[PDB]
Amino acid sequence: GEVFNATRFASVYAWNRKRISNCVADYSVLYNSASFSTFKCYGVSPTK
Amino acid sequence: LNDLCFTNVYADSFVIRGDEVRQIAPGQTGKIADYNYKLPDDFTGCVIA
């Protein structure tokens, strides 16, 4: 939630990073909320 | 394509939101791709928007 819509994103020079682990990952609930126009993925298909 | 003769051709015309123009590409997934319309990966044809 906090990475899709925060108060204001850190600038490109000081881009924000955190490790995410020990949870379950799914895209269906949150992808459509922040609708996008450029989804190009290299190693992994979105469905897989 | 002017120098080729076609066995049969199908024309599918429909209205798309301005931002979704790149959703009709083979392999590309999304809301209208998965729930509305999508085309096979080995698709031979040309698109005009």
Single-letter code of the amino acid located at A28: S
Residue B11: DSSP 8-state: -
Buried b (16+ CB within 10 A) or exposed e, A19-47: eeeeeeeeeeeeeeeeeeeeeeeeeeeee
User: Which residue, among B37, B48, B40, has the nearest Cα to B1 in the 3D structure?
Assistant: B48
Closest Cβ–Cβ partner in A32, A37, A45 for B19: A37
What is the nearest CA distance from B38 to chain A, expressed in angstroms?
Answer: 14
**CA-to-CA distance for B21 and A48, rounded, in angstroms?**
23
CB neighbour list of residue A27: distance below 8 Å, 6 or more residues apart: A46
- Annotated resolution, angstroms: 3.0
**Alpha carbon distances (Å) from B6 to B2, B3, B9, B34, B48:** 10, 10, 7, 30, 18
For residues B37 and B23, is the Cβ–Cβ distance under 8 A? no
Say whether residue B30 is in contact with chain A using an 8 A CB cutoff: yes
Say whether residue B41 is in contact with chain A using an 8 A CB cutoff: no
Method: cryo-EM
For residues B20 and B30, is the Cβ–Cβ distance under 8 A? yes
Buried b (16+ CB within 10 A) or exposed e, B2-19: eeeeeeeeeeeeeeeeee
Say whether residue A37 is in contact with chain B using an 8 A CB cutoff: yes
